[PDB]
Amino acid sequence: IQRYVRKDGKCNVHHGNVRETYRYLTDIFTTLVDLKWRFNLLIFVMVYTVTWLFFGMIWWLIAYIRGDMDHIEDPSWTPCVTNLNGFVSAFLFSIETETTIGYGYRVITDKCPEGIILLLIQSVLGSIVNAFMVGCMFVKISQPKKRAETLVFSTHAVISMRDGKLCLMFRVGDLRNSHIVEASIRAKLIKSKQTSEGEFIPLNQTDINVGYYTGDDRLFLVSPLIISHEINQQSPFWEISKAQLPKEELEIVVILEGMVEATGMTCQARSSYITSEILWGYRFTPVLTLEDGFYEVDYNSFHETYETSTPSLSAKELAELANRAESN
Amino acid sequence: IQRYVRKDGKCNVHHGNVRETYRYLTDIFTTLVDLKWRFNLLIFVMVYTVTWLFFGMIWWLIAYIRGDMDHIEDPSWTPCVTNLNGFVSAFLFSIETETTIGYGYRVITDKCPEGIILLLIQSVLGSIVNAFMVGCMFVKISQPKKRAETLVFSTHAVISMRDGKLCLMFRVGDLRNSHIVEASIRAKLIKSKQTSEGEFIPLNQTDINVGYYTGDDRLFLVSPLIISHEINQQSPFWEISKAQLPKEELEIVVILEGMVEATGMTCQARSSYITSEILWGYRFTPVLTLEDGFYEVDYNSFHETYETSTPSLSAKELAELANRAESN
Amino acid sequence: IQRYVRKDGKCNVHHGNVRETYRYLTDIFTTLVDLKWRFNLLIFVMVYTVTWLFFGMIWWLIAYIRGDMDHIEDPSWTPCVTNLNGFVSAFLFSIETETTIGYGYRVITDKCPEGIILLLIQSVLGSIVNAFMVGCMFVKISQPKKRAETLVFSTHAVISMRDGKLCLMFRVGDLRNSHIVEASIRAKLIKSKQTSEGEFIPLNQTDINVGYYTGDDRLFLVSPLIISHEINQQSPFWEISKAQLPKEELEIVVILEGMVEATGMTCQARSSYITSEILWGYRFTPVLTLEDGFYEVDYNSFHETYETSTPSLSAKELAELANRAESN
Amino acid sequence: IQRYVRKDGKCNVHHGNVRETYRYLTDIFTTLVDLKWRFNLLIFVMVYTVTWLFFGMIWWLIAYIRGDMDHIEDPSWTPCVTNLNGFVSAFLFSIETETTIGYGYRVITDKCPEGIILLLIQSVLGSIVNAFMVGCMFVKISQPKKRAETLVFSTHAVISMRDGKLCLMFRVGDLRNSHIVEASIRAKLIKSKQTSEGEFIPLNQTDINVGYYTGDDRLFLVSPLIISHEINQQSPFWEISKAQLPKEELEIVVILEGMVEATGMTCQARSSYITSEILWGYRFTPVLTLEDGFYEVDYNSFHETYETSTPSLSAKELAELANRAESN
């Protein structure tokens, strides 16, 4: 079955018929850092080689129009750049200058102002281009989405009874010793619907409660946590029994958002649970054990669940039993 | 008619009679990065050329006061900077030094401490100025407002019935495959008012509810979303019928705020719906279709709406019909 | 009278008897960027001059222990660094190397590995020190608190009647065309108190409501806004009449927090209203006027207020009149 | 007794049996900046020395395959790099080039394109590697967790009566004159539990209320603040008397999260109070005193508490006395 979101977090959507494609060029920086690495590294190589060529020809051109080329056998003549024997030497000086290596076998001189104003322009644009590209690299290396790689979601969501309440539970973890700051968990139920009046709504998102009113959706996440959605009157699973579950066409999107401790930058880790990955009547297997001075987590057991005695009834039907029980 | 906010997000306000203009110089960095590009690139060129000139004259000056200029025919004499034949050579050494190209035809020496302490000062201020300016460039290129270019708002807001409730709806979209992290939507109604007591309040902002109490204002925005404001008792559209709408003098400001995935930086995309852009009795045309392995969006249809059967009554009058219907 | 917070935002508190002062050295970066500019620029100059000296002596030392110094009249002998005639030349090479100007009159050679491993160490530490310091500069220039300079608070808070409710109002503004993203306003009442049991609490902070439950504390701030605190049953001004106000010993701290549009960084602008700056029975003078295509703000009038007819009674006593009025 | 969180903020947990260790390499930047300094500085040294060697051999190799090595006695022959007498000179040119010191005793030439395309590759990768590493340093120096060093938590939590309510109180402070922006305090109670149905939950986190519904959890923190948790019906200390406290097996985790004023980056300071550090019947000793123009804090007294008359009863039992008192 098709899902909206993959277990690893990527989203199965393509944006077609974007009539106004120039917008991608309007915020070029976003397109650049969003590219695949091969394409950054390609552009990176190109941006540098074309500038050095582009200036290299302008350095050659000053030397040509000046007549430096024509008098190389005459020492009386002095050029813009000492030693520009040909079209190759210009390329090298062009790099020697803009990288600011400037070996100084090729050296500029007093004799032309035409050259000085180029060295000037170059150095300036050399800084602006170099910023743009190095900046682009730094951002791409340091970007926070990468942290998501050391944030795990449990492979299944489970439904079982907890202190008399029927609960939907998934487990989350963080493989690093460092932290997710201002950590928080939110969850969205994704399923299509139809209004009384006729409107079909493709992949309708309804927020699932996972601590919003108590601030228990704000996580302190060191050892793995089991996030619990209590299936109450206000739940979208209120009228879903063990029987009905597999015949429902729904998907739970789970989103973990906080700041990578070292870069202040906010990360978003995502995963999905489709109807078949929601185990009814199950419990997560413990992972925590005590050792001398430290609590040790056993990630082998992180995804593992086991079965428990659990009603087949919808949460709603459990209430109906309770209403008669308290009234008895 | 005059609007407060343009559809593209820019705001029609000018800040006149700012008596204390020095404040703009107090936080210079904000003024700089807020400038138009022509003016950054201008200042950028200028800041660099004046330093190189300013030092170039000081390099010339040491050479003049020392008497290096007077003895160029004497090799016994050795200068601060080998080869400073005139006022031009000094400018070149000044750049050769501060860019740190340092071709080394112009080379400093032991003979003057006067020169060494300059090379010292220069290099230090060369780093501080270079930071300030390159930094200023980097910030301006990477700034998040730019993302707003690949965030679209629907061209109209529509009002129609949804599961028995009258709703104001606008649609939002994101043209990129990358994400808006900690995405959230808020909306402000802008219209003037008068208190019982007499006070006129120019462009009074009252927050429009778009999910605040359920956290459904926190968006997971991949494919386009239709943001719904339920027009209930607490709504500012409670007493507005189809008839009255066009004769109201109001404007809805819509604000999308989240973090650009790659730079942790927060973006704010804005748009406005003036009274004439609010289509009563309309529905948004679907955009989502299924393809092999991927959900495809059709942005051609993004802004498109169609008409449906919809009451001409205000939400309030619909309730009055319901009160008698339930009491019947 | 002593205030806790100045009108410009600075806080009248000193942190004395910090026994564990090393902590300031533990997070050195915070102390550095928190310093006055004179002291950054001082340290900046020093950090660079001591490294260049420190290496300069090590460059001199290799040259001394090797015996390069003793043979300068012998060309057969070749040194670590060509041309190190004395203790001054070493300082210059040391800079020429670490700034990477490297004029190359002073050039390293094959003949000693002792020199190569220094050039190596230097270049590496040259990058680490240069990062630390340039970074420190960049941060300090770009820091967001500076924006606060172009965020104004009204000079007074006023109390007057608004649609039958008694309200405490202050006005806020933003002098720039650019934005404060995720803008929000919160306000704290600061006054001492005593518990029934005996405990004196020095400067007790109680949050003042300014939109928290409706999200109207989240500002869209283009033209100036009048922030309104409705003085209701839950207000700390519930039992304060015009008469009692000046004899109360209290201070309202007002805090504006949002993100500078260009740097994603969060700014905090603060101000205070002491009991004497709270004008009872007053209204803010309008500032907004319409011009062709643009709304123009008149900051001359920003702080200005005028008097209106307003009850001398506490909000509580107004309710008591209303209770008998509705019961009549 | 074992705690979950240390008083200084570090967490007693180890992540064992991480089967998928490659993920650490997938987001390498996080692993790098998370390393101990010795290991950054080690890698930093290594990354640079291996590139310079790696290129140095390629520079040597071009010189070898070309036959430059074989003709050093022939001036007719001209090499890729003037002066590459051996395997050592190549290493030096390799650094001279990539650091961009380029002393220019070793200079590239026209004669080989083989060399030019290397200089090209090098300079490009020289920028990418240099970014990666300097960036990594900058991040690590500027990271916000460090601020936590100048944020103190009181050594004990105390329980005493405040205006008729039994309260759990701890005190927090900030040693710097600079601010924590968007400051906020949250607190989690950590103790194991067992569901009716059988499920043991290892270290169950239940959020402790410390201002969430009034926004008094949002701190304006200049002088020290006493954070108060009112022990009401909804409290986890509702049924805990002075008698029972020490026999409970619980731990309160306290978390302070806000932005370092200068870097926009968010900091998280943590501490813990185990059952024995919760003083029943105690009050914090004042720290604030007035001086000419400034409020002075006395951090000697910051942690100090003193005893007061305080009920031995649980908050619940105090209510039961009140129920009969009001009914009397």
Ligand SMILES: [K+]
């Ligand atoms: K250089």
Ligand SMILES: [K+]
């Ligand atoms: K150089």
Ligand SMILES: [K+]
């Ligand atoms: K050089």
Ligand SMILES: [K+]
């Ligand atoms: K040189």
Ligand SMILES: [K+]
């Ligand atoms: K936030």
Ligand code: NA
């Ligand atoms: Na962790």
Ligand code: NA
């Ligand atoms: Na998207």
Ligand code: NA
């Ligand atoms: Na503004």
Ligand code: NA
């Ligand atoms: Na402080």
